[PDB]
Amino acid sequence: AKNIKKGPAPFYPLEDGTAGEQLHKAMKRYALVPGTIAFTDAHIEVNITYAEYFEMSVRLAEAMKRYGLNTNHRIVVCSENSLQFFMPVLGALFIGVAVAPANDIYNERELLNSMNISQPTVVFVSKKGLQKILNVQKKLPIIQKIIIMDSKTDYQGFQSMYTFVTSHLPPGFNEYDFVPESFDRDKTIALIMNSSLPKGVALPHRTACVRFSHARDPIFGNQIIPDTAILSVIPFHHAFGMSTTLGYLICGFRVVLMYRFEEELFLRSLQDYKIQSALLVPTLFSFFAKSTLIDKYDLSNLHEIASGGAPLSKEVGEAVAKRFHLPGIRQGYGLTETTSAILITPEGDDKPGAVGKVVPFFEAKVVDLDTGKTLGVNQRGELCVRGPMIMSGYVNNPEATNALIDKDGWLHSGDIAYWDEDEHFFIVDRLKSLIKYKGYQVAPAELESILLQHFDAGVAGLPDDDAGELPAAVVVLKTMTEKEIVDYVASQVTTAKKLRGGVVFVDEVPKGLTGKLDARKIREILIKAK
Ligand SMILES: Nc1ncnc2c1ncn2[C@@H]1O[C@H](COS(=O)(=O)NC(=O)c2csc(-c3nc4ccc(O)cc4s3)n2)[C@@H](O)[C@H]1O
């Protein structure tokens, strides 16, 4: 148990009450300070204050309570990042209604699969997504009501959130006398998120409360300080975006949002909102690996860039940190099933390449794939974590649940990792993404992070008769041909991790979610081509 990595005591303590109660308390305090901005749409340059956000969320909460939504119900929220997004989230948390964010770029099949699991009584949806909701709806009689989020009037026959609250809110309603519901926070679901074919990740209120400790933690999150502005290009429906933003709201920060990344706007927004901290995913670290515009703008307020969701190249990360004049890139490692990051780069405890250290209340260990024994320092194995932020289980799928989490409460991440003498953790890859040329493992990240100098590519395992797999790549180019690339690699690495059967040229590398690589799509581009 010298081989169990334990998070320290928190620097900001766990708070009583439901996630809702805590979000209510914080945002009521912030609402009472004039001019405090909750969100900012960088695109249309519009702000919404904590006072506004608070009142509308509360109205929405009460409106829902009167409509009959109780702890036994579920709503989905289906939208791109927007000013309205968190209104029905907050409303639903205040009164103990589970929120099921659904990915706003699902096709209809993916969308139907999700909602078929979350079984929502009410659907909050953006104009951009209404149509897809309408198509899948016939196969989901559970849905009783559709409500448009980003319109003020009724829209195509459906009530807006504003016409909806109108319908049920008394005229004698005072928001500041509203009291959030109280209930058991271990037993009551705050969130149902997707991970993916798809599963519903159920997250008790308690996991969010724990998140709010981390979020407010000055060492593992951000210290509450007035006039803090953050720029986030993370999808609010993903655990990354949902858990950071809710954290930022508990912290009274200004969340500057964007529903789509664009290099110029991003950069100008950092400058003009005096952004102290920006959230990215590694996929975007290319745009600053090319740079050019970044030195125009004034980024002298930026203290921090945080990445998560996918492996960040060590060189790329070091490289991009320099260009923003930052000591390093802050990192967070998490799973939808752990609610948020459980490995985080602690302030003033860096290490290039590491994803950080065990968060407060948590424990981590690396285990042997064959016997499950706990491994020691620098020993690669499967990353396991346990703590009060781990989901209560998959929705209506107890088999997958027991498959993921054991008696001792250890979650098996499917990631290969190790920790060093300083208790820093390093992610190697998904166990599934590793390639075995003889009996010898090859990690994709290792071959990708030697290609990036010669634009962008994705290494995968080209199956075989008698080797099992052969390291292969899928690449995005002014000119250099296959044999010239294979031979280039063969001059760079050792015997067994050569591209012994690689290279296929493509438009763009099949990336997904929060800038992660599709092992599948790449491993079929290659199989199709041979
Ligand atoms: N930092 C990382 N480095 C390398 N790989 C990473 C990674 N994070 C996720 N991954 C990969 O994503 C998989 C899970 O994807 S997932 O299930 O969609 N969920 C996630 O990726 C996920 C859920 S919560 C979360 C984060 N929360 C944060 C809070 C603050 C902060 O500063 C940084 C972060 S990242 N990420 C993991 O198994 C792993 O393979």
Report which of 46, 50, 35, 77 is spatially closest to residue 250, judged by C-alpha positions: 50
State which ligand 1 atom lies nearest to the alpha carbon of 330.
32
13-49+205-348, CATH topology level = Rossmann fold (3.40.50)
Q: Which residues contact 185 (CB under 8 A, 6 or more apart)?
A: 17, 18, 19, 204, 205, 206, 209
In this structure, the number of other CB atoms found within 10 A of the CB of residue 420 comes to 12
Tokens of 108: 């209809």
CATH of domain 50-204: 3.40.50.980
Report which ligand 1 atom has the smallest distance to the Cα of 339.
24
Q: Return the residue whose CA atom lies nearest to atom 8 of ligand 1.
A: 309
| Token code pair at residue 178 | 């509203």
3-state secondary structure of 476: strand
Q: Which residues of 124-161 are buried (b: 16+ CB within 10 A; e: fewer)?
A: bbbbbbbebbeebbeebeebeebbbbbbeeebeebbbb
Atom 3 of ligand 1: nearest residue by CA position: 311
The domain spans of the chain are: 1-12+349-427, 13-49+205-348, 50-204, 428-530
Our CA dihedral for 408, 411, 416, 418, rounded to 10 degrees, sits at -50
Report the structure determination method.
Answer: X-ray
Would you say the CB of residue 308 lies under 6 angstroms from ligand 1? yes
Angle at 350 between CA 346 and CA 358, to 5 degrees: 40
CA 109 to chain centre: 22
Mutate to test the pocket of ligand 1, among 219, 240, 277, 279 (most ligand atoms within 8 A of CB): 240
Q: Which residues pair with 76 in a beta bridge?
A: 100, 123
Ligand 1 binding pocket includes 116 (Cβ within 6 Å): no
Q: Which CATH class is domain 1-12+349-427?
A: mainly beta
DSSP class of residue 80 equals S
State in Å, rounded, how far the first CA of the chain is from the last one. 48
∠ CA(173), CA(175), CA(181), 5° rounding? 105
Intrachain domains 13-49+205-348 and 50-204 with the same fold = yes
- Residue 256's DSSP bridge partners are 40, 231
Taken as a whole, the chain contains a residue count of: 530
Exposure of 373 by Cβ count < 10 A (0-12 exposed, 13-18 middle, 19+ buried)? exposed
Resolution in A: 2.5
The answer to whether the CB of 160 falls within 8 A of the CB of 151 is yes
CA distance 518 to 147: 34
Q: Angle formed by the axes of helices 205-216 and 239-250, to 10°?
A: 60
CA distances from 90 to 15, 159, 223, 246, 249 (A): 18, 19, 22, 9, 10
